[PDB]
From a paper:
Here, we report that [name] binds host complement factor I (FI) and facilitates cleavage of complement components C3b and C4b independently of any cofactors (e.g., FH, C4BP), thereby allowing the pathogen to evade host defence.
To identify structural features of [name] that would aid in its function, we sought a high-resolution crystal structure of the protein. Thus, to improve the chance of protein crystallization, we modified the protein construct by removing the first 94 N-terminal residues, predicted to be disordered, and mutating a stretch of surface-exposed, charged residues (E315A, K316A, and K317A) at the C-terminus. The modified variant [name]-195 and its selenomethionine derivative were then used to solve and refine the protein structure to a resolution of 2.0 Å. [name] is a predominantly β-stranded structure which forms an N-terminal domain (NTD) and a C-terminal domain (CTD) connected by a 13-residue linker peptide. We also observed two short helices present in the loop regions of the protein. Noticeably, the overall architecture of [name] resembles that of previously known Slam-dependent SLPs.
Author numbering: 103 to 318
């Protein structure tokens, strides 16, 4: 049921008559399947309904916009991968480094997409990494292995306020605002094993998706 040729999204149609009455801001929610090209896919550069990053024919990540009450809009982060392309090798002594991006929104700005840079190192099973601000080397999150499983990480904040947010987080490894993430190693269509790494997670205060590529 993976199909980068028909990716689910919502078209959210503004209700014009809400300009002059107490009707919902959104008139209708309509399903709309997108066919992805390699790289960044979006319909509008300044008010996109969705952004998806097809890293490879076998895996994408991104978000589409949703609303539960037809008034408030929030980004829904997701990822998908060809099932057969997932790598199930034993990665307990894995040696590799990944570089990519973390896309997220915060509870007080649920429709505002924040992009950060992400780095993850596998050294003989030890899993450690970091999430940095897009344009400068400020550390936003620490990444660490969870439960001695190379496919599970724990991500915890190292700042009290994320970009574009005024929601105060607690910092550090015992922070109740940390979260755990299941990761999936995806092989490339050009025969690179474990080339791509995707997962997603959430807390009450922020939620997002992680997508990464191996350093060759």
């Amino acid at each position: 049921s993976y199909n980068k040729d028909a990716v689910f999204t919502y078209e959210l149609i503004a209700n014009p008559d809400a300009d002059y009455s107490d009707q919902k801001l959104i008139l209708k929610k309509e399903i709309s399947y997108i066919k992805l090209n390699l790289g960044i896919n979006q319909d509008n550069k300044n008010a996109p309904s969705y952004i998806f990053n097809l890293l490879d024919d076998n895996v994408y990540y991104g978000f589409y916009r949703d609303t539960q009450d037809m008034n408030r809009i929030e980004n829904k982060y997701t990822y998908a991968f060809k099932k057969e392309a997932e790598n199930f090798d034993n990665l307990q002594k894995f040696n590799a480094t990944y570089e990519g991006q973390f896309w997220f929104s915060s509870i007080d700005t649920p429709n505002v997409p924040t992009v950060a840079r992400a780095f993850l190192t596998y050294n003989n099973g030890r899993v450690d990494g970091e999430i940095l601000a897009k344009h400068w080397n400020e550390k936003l999150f620490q990444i660490t292995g969870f439960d001695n499983n190379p496919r599970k990480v724990e991500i915890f904040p190292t700042v009290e306020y994320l970009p574009n947010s005024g929601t105060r987080l607690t910092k550090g490894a015992t922070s109740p605002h940390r979260f755990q993430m299941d990761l999936h190693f995806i092989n490339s269509t050009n025969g690179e094993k474990n080339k791509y790494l995707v997962g997603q997670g959430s807390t009450e205060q922020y939620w997002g998706v992680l997508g990464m590529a191996a350093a060759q």
